[PDB]
Amino acid sequence: SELSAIETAAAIAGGSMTALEACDAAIARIEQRDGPINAVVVRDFDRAREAAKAADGEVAAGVSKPLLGVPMTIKESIDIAGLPTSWGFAEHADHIATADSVVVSRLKAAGAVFLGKTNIPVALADWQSSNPNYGRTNNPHDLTRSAGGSSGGAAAALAAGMVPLEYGSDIGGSIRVPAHFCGVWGLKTTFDAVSLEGHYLPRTDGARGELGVVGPMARNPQDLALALDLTSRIALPIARIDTLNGLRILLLTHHPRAAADSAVVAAVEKAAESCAAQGAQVSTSNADLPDLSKLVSDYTRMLLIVLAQGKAPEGTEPVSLNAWYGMLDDQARTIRGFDRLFDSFDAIFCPVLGTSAFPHSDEADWGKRTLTIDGADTPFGSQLAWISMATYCGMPALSMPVGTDANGLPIGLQIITRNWSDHDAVRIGALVADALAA
Template identity: 55%
Template sequence: MKTALQTAAAIRAGETTALAECEAAIARIEAGDAEINAVVVRDFDRAREAARAIDAGPKDSRPLLGVPMTVKESFDVAGLVTCWGFAEHADFIATEDAVQVTRLKRAGAVILGKTNIPVALADLQTNNPVYGRTRNPHDPSRVSGGSSGGAAAALAAGFVPVEIGSDIGGSIRLPAAFCGVWGHKPTYNALSSFGHNFPRTQSCGVALNVVGPLARDPDDLETLFGVMGGDALVRPAPRGPGDWKILLLPQHPLARSQAAIQGAITTLGAAFAAAGAQVDDSSALLPDLVAQHGAYIHMLLVAMARGAPLEGGTPLALPDWFTLIDAQAKCRRDWARLFASYDAVIAPIWGTTAYRHDDTPLATRMIDIDGTQTPMALQMAYPGLATFPMLPATSVPIGTDPDGLPIGVQVIADYNRDFTAIAIARTAHDLMRS
């Protein structure tokens, strides 16, 4: 399958048409999605109309000219359902496009439909009573991740070249890693999230949450990030593999990681070092990761519940919320000091590769890590590394585990240095393939 940029270039050159590419993508979905269940809201007739309109117009320089793609169900698309997996909202039809959907269309993209999510975007796997379960294209007995699980599965299955998702607890990075594709969690507030709202609300963005791109190809990922609004951020000067300063973090002090993932990160570090890069496996500059995780989980739970107390609990008092904000500010300063000495931290996104479907409540769910059962909730320490201090992080595939499942890691960079994270992730991928 062509990349998004290759598709747009071929349409521009008259080598194919937007309608032909649209029909090919529809055919791939219709042939392959019965088992995977990724594309759960289909809008094929309007996609064909949009493709015909592009073919009838000028073959301009829009970066996604005629590119067929899908978007995460939680983004509003005028005329389509936005229910976030809630049965009670399955009849809600959006009346206008989300900001990011508008930007995609202006860039020439053809929207085929929407991809699956867990209920309320609140799980690390994708299953809900409205659309059912999404399965990992590499092994249908395994999860595709969540909450952008349908997005990553659609990419991994080869249905479309690019997608958009959202991330508050690894919801872009984790599905990308589990499915062996690329994903980028932007710096907090770098991209507009208007139109990515809880159904039937005009709610403000949730604290910590961001929207961002997923792709099968790093050039597509970078371009899509720019289309979504990332072009306002600074790009690093071109550098060779030996010009970076890298800190490795193969395992969090609170959360185990598979030996295969640790080994892949160690191998990647050796490849960077062999290319001449500065590579360290420890640093006194690292923030207090245990304290960071505690504050992150507290803020995450409050944000996801929009301040509602846990059953039997009491609402968080406003002074306590400001205490969390203060802890976040300190955490951001601590990471900024580290990034005065390093360009990136490379760490797991999750301590395992894609695990088997398990509908046990997340709070009590267990996961096997090299033969040891450990609480899955502790694994949230990995996505929280970048989420709590509002940092950009790129999910990049760098290998496979002994079962042939993809291994993805996250490249975390300094605040607003999103293109640095993508550049180092691209180098990491290339080094592991050479």
């Protein structure tokens, strides 16, 4: 029942409230609600209110901008000038960013006001949000369960109504998974569509690596689309879809490399059937589908080199540059596989993860964790499979809410579309949400 980012900005423009009122309202929601959740772990309420007063001076001087005065937070790994950027490392608790990231600079240019930053796991390397600098973030829907990660505090802050807009990062599901666990909307954008300048490992300032993207998170698709138009390095193509009638969907509720709970499958299946009733052509199989089992292995191989920065454990020999160049050839061949697939389909519908939010785990080694799927214990890491298609091949991928499991925990749907059609993904998810309400 909270105002959206667009609605807030309209309110501030129309006279209904001052940016400073909106900024103190958000501070109030945060101080009153973040106690048991612990999502907004870096606070800048003092400078935020100064910037809000300023946003009020612009308003009264006749100025308008699409997010003027709108309070929001950002992920702790994205730089804001004057604020820490530790990525959850004790050794970098006091690393203080000198300059706004590009994404932050873009949104501040749209008039937004940054109240603070949201919690993350150590090294952005978990589907939870816990670290020694700030503590743990808890799912607002069940405080005993993970908020997801690594953008987990962002998803929790959105879910608890604290702010209307957020922005996150994803290399192994870290936008889509928190959005799914907390019941909010998250967009993994097309690879290279938004700049990662300011999303730096603490004390470094180099180049974007492969695979990872930044993308917006919110409670509705309109805010996502606005936030994407304001942050993309070039204006992206606009949405071609306007109706589910004739939309061509490929429904995947099975992965050769990971299981999915019945309640997740059923939630995803029901979303496709709602679209079919508004006229969609839902297929369950296609011979153009790339080998998803090979894809998961290529993705893993490359992921572990990227995250290691090509360095190797002492005793092991590193990957050669030429071998790396071969790995990008492989990646490139696979991407072309999805190009042919998307000649026959407008979207893939599949799960974000095989389960809804799991109980907090203090076990660092994914190999020692499990996940209950239909009563059985199943391997935890196996679930990267659901997340691999869009990261490895670079496609945009929405995570949107489509139901709740039997315990009341949110379940999300992953909507994948062709490279650079990020707005078509957000549009389809908006129409999916309509079809499910009708």
